[PDB]
Structure 1
Amino acid sequence: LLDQTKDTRITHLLRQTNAFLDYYNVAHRIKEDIKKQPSILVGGTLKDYQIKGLQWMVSLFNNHLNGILADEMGLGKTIQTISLLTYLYEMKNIRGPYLVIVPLSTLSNWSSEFAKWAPTLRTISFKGSPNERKAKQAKIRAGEFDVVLTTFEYIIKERALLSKVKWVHMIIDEGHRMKNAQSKLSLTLNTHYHADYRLILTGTPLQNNLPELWALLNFVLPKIFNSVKSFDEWFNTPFDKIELSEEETLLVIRRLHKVLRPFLLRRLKKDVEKELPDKVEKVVKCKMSALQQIMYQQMLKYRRLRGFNNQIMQLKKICNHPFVFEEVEDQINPTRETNDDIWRVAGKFELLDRILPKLKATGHRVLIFFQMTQIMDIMEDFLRYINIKYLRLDGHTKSDERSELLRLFNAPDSEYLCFILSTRAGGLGLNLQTADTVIIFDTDWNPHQDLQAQDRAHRIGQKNEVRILRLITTNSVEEVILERAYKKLDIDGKVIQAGKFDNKSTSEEQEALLRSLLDAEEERRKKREELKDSEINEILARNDEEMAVLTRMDEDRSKKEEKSRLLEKKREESESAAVYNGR
């Protein structure tokens, strides 16, 4: 059936693609396959799957094919790229002027890799005020160079000057920022014109929404935007799932990745380098105060009675933590100083009262991630309220403050268990293994976020266990979204499960992915389906010692028994503070 439509597109529209100068047969036709590492390769050696996918892309562009790479971080995609380019100058002898573009964050280290590898051939970078620019602008206007490296800023700016010159190959990095259609990169390339070849990268490919595949892929070939509008029909319907997108798109869509097997490489560190010790994964529940519920119920009304722009405002603030507008506390406590009821108000707090102490008693270092970093504000002083050793960082902490603080908490002896973060902003790329423990107050709100929140710790070199620790309160929207993007947690592993056979490029993969898949959904509908911290005490053992001594933390809070758990009423501020929340 529709596989034959696929085939037609394959042969003919491929012919048109190569004019623009399965697929697997016809896409791989042009034969250059080299398992060597090239000559000038210096200062380290591949993990030679790197040779394999290397060679794969080699054939791509020898097949006259651009590419898109899904590879996991820590595999030195950097090198792979580099050595590739070196090869182009090198055995290909092409010496083509090649554009490389990265986020400003890492460009330092990328330069560093030119150092460790190919000072043998030039680079050109850009940053640092007009002067350096106009200088090296003369350099490229001089035309002499080997590599030209930059970030997106001066792409925007000098892009006219850049576009002046013709181009052979063109590299694009963190290419999932191409995620968005009108993110100016693409169209500014239309004006900027183009290089005969191109490449896109991603650490993690993105939402199964999949314009994700489109903007990228369409941008790889004209065939891909027109055909992938016919696949605007197809993928508009890409997901009666068992009647369409489950039983069938095994065939249809999992064979659309079988379509994309010539078009993609992905790899798995813990399959190859396989140094991940473990991560042990949990989510739990909490109560929310009568304010945070009963009033929040009345403040559901107040969501419609600001109290407005509900989701991020109402739902997430209140359903997270209190006095976001502070009349809560102040009206209640004018002294505004830390006190009892800060632990009481949102169950996450009193929880922290029930866990963080044991963390200390178990001495295990914690990194956490947040949104609207203001919540973490409470955290500081909440911690102060016991006076606990901690650090904090947010998206607003400055660059070298960041690098510094990294080193600081990274002190092997650092008295800080708690170094607390903003998810995407503070996180960026990092590996901090001086912390053995991870905790989460918030949704994924797309997975890759808290996937970073996973990949800070147990990325290569953290061999201690990993408790993945989530707070979703009973009868809350974080439940809702939780299983929304957590659907995506079965959705990512699903079409991206197709990515998970195509990674290795072999079908036996997808054959494990059969019940990986269907078993996953089994779990998903086990969700068709209130915690006393006793049980938690019994789940927190990374050894049985932890059990004993923490149960004796409960000797302590046992015999000295600690007030009500939640804020539960007061009642004058019910009506009055209700109407002041009724705005």
Structure 2
Amino acid sequence: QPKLLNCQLKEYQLKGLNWLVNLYEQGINGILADEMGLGKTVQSISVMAYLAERYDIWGPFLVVAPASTLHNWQQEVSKFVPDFKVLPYWGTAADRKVLRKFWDRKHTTYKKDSPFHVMITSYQLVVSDVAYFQKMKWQYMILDEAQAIKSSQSSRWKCLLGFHCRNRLLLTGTPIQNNMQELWALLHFIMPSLFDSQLKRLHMILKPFMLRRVKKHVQKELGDKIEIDVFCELSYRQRAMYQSLRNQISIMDTLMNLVMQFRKVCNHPDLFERAPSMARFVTDSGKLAKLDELLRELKEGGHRVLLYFQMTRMIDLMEEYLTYRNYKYCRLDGSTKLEDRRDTVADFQTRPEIFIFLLSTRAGGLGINLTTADTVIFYDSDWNPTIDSQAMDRAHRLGQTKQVTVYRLITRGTIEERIRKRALQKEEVQRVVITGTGS
């Protein structure tokens, strides 16, 4: 391993470094599709550290990541390779306008004496600042959570496709997503000459370009997830709403509006129309009634717990209930500013006092480590099993020591069931499409 590293790569990660090095030295690009929590970051960083250590390329190295991952990757690269001067390219336009003063355009290869070596950037900024970005030449590009790039009609695909870069990685734990075209977009991006626009063939052609190990094999020290399915019925208020709403199917089947209204009442009828008493507010949502009994048991267990919502208005209502109860919580959603994210995550991870993290599906589902929680609760299931898997794999990562449990509140006899059954069967489709070897 490159001597720049602070902490030793594990056996499978060293094999992963070797694959990434061979991809580079053979002049080709590939996807590190290693499962969640296997340590894609240390392998990818060790590539950059090898380009530095072996070929004296001290960048310019680009990291693109989701906004909640940015502080995590800045910290971890500082941990694993302190020699790399990070440029944390995020901020307001005026703050970014100052940070551009560190971009040396004269050197196409930076040396250790350089204003920066690794630049870490949001998927948002490579698009908004694209006009600045495409005027620079990158010696290696890493893309975290490459499922962000899965749509070829997305501006972030079109923009990053056109970046002048020698070699590129896609990092993901969930490559397949919804369709073969979404897989192609990841394959075209890495190797545009080969993949310009049956499973026996697929697993043969992709073998050089994707590497994927799984926790069942390499990380079996961590116990399996305990998934639990927690059915509850529509309380009398909810079914009065749901049935009078379903009466619109005397005309329809607007249906795409109705399925969002049906999801709202399955979360809490106050989302549809607010009432009043907090005792009624608990019992007039069946999910919240079953959750209250569950949190009551989990607290006596000492089970620090992550609650995932598909709605923002629900995570508001949720902390009204958490302030009616005695429960100490913290919160993270797509509106919390990035320094607020860093501090809340670090706060939760530091002090065991906090019981609940009210955590968003998307903004709270990727990149970050939450190993001091042990329980994950989906208040809402999601249409994409990869997203719910990403959310639940925030615990159950290489730092975990407690057993992990995953609960899922499903309102029986509602579209909450169709959503979960449709998302669940896609996991089998995605598993079948990964029937071949990933090694």
- TM (normalized to structure 2)? 0.84
Q: Secondary structure of the residue that 2:105 maps to in structure 1? A: helix
Whether 1:423 aligns to 2:361 is yes
Match of 1:488 in 2: 426
CA distance in 2, matches of 1:74, 1:264: 17
Is the alpha carbon distance of 1:303 and 1:135 closer, same or farther for their aligned partners in structure 2, counting shifts above 3 Å? farther
Match of 1:349 in 2: 288
Match of 1:284 in 2: 230
Q: 2:90 aligns with which of 124, 127, 132?
A: 127
* 1:217 CA drift (Å): 0.8
Q: Secondary structure of the residue that 1:433 maps to in structure 2? A: coil
Match of 1:268 in 2: 214
Q: Which amino acid aligns with 1:276?
A: L
Match of 2:110 in 1: 145
Match of 1:180 in 2: 151
Is the alpha carbon distance of 1:438 and 1:256 closer, same or farther for their aligned partners in structure 2, counting shifts above 3 Å? same
Instruction: Give deviations 1:295-314, integer Å, cap 9, x for gaps.
Output: 42221124677x97435532
* 1:479 CA drift (Å): 0.8
* 1:486 CA drift (Å): 0.9
CA distance in 2, matches of 1:411, 1:190: 39
Contact 1:124 1:145 in 2 (8 A): no
* 1:187 CA drift (Å): 2.7
Which has the bigger relative contact order, CA under 8 A and spacing at least 6? 2
Q: 2:54 aligns with which of 91, 113, 116?
A: 91
CA distance in 2, matches of 1:118, 1:392: 31
Contact 1:373 1:394 in 2 (8 A): no
Q: Which amino acid aligns with 2:279?
A: N
Instruction: Give deviations 1:5-31, integer Å, cap 9, x for gaps.
Output: xxxxxxxxxxxxxxxxxxxxxxxxxxx
Instruction: Give deviations 1:306-353, integer Å, cap 9, x for gaps.
Output: x974355321011222122435x2xxxxxx33233x333232233234
Contact 1:170 1:195 in 2 (8 A): yes
Is the alpha carbon distance of 1:55 and 1:411 closer, same or farther for their aligned partners in structure 2, counting shifts above 3 Å? closer
Contact 1:393 1:426 in 2 (8 A): no
* 1:123 CA drift (Å): 5.8
Q: 2:204 aligns with which of 222, 239, 258?
A: 258
Match of 1:337 in 2: 277
Whether 1:445 aligns to 2:383 is yes
Gaps of 5+ in 1: 1-36, 230-251, 330-335, 506-583
* 1:480 CA drift (Å): 0.7
Q: Secondary structure of the residue that 2:344 maps to in structure 1? A: helix
Q: Secondary structure of the residue that 2:202 maps to in structure 1? A: helix
Contact 2:37 2:398 in 1 (8 A): yes
Q: 2:331 aligns with which of 383, 389, 393?
A: 393
Instruction: Give deviations 1:105-144, integer Å, cap 9, x for gaps.
Output: 434454445544555566655334144324113x334667
CA distance in 2, matches of 1:440, 1:63: 44
Match of 1:436 in 2: 374
Q: Which amino acid aligns with 1:337?
A: S
Contact 1:409 1:419 in 2 (8 A): yes
* 1:104 CA drift (Å): 4.2
Whether 1:106 aligns to 2:69 is yes
Match of 1:237 in 2: none
CA distance in 2, matches of 1:113, 1:302: 52
Match of 2:114 in 1: none
The number of residue pairs the alignment matches comes to 427
- TM (normalized to structure 1)? 0.65
Match of 1:322 in 2: 269
Q: Secondary structure of the residue that 1:91 maps to in structure 2? A: helix
Match of 1:11 in 2: none
* 1:288 CA drift (Å): 0.7
CA distance in 2, matches of 1:103, 1:481: 26
Match of 1:156 in 2: 127
Instruction: List structure 1 segments (4+ residues) > 6 angstroms apart after TM superposition.
Output: none
Whether 1:81 aligns to 2:44 is yes
CA distance in 1, matches of 2:78, 2:296: 47
* 1:186 CA drift (Å): 3.6
* 1:393 CA drift (Å): 1.4
CA distance in 2, matches of 1:169, 1:466: 36
Is the alpha carbon distance of 1:315 and 1:208 closer, same or farther for their aligned partners in structure 2, counting shifts above 3 Å? same
Q: Secondary structure of the residue that 2:6 maps to in structure 1? A: coil
Contact 1:283 1:472 in 2 (8 A): yes
Contact 1:279 1:468 in 2 (8 A): yes
CA distance in 2, matches of 1:450, 1:436: 16
CA distance in 1, matches of 2:309, 2:329: 14
Q: Which has the higher helix share?
A: 1
CA distance in 2, matches of 1:412, 1:97: 37
Instruction: Give deviations 1:212-261, integer Å, cap 9, x for gaps.
Output: 211111223345444xx4xxxxxxxxxxxxxxxxxxxxxx3044213311
Identity among equivalent positions (%) equals 44
Q: Quote the RMSD (CA, aligned, Å).
A: 3.1
Whether 1:313 aligns to 2:260 is yes
Contact 2:349 2:372 in 1 (8 A): yes
Q: Secondary structure of the residue that 1:456 maps to in structure 2? A: coil
CA distance in 1, matches of 2:230, 2:185: 38
Gaps of 5+ in 2: 112-116
Contact 1:318 1:324 in 2 (8 A): yes
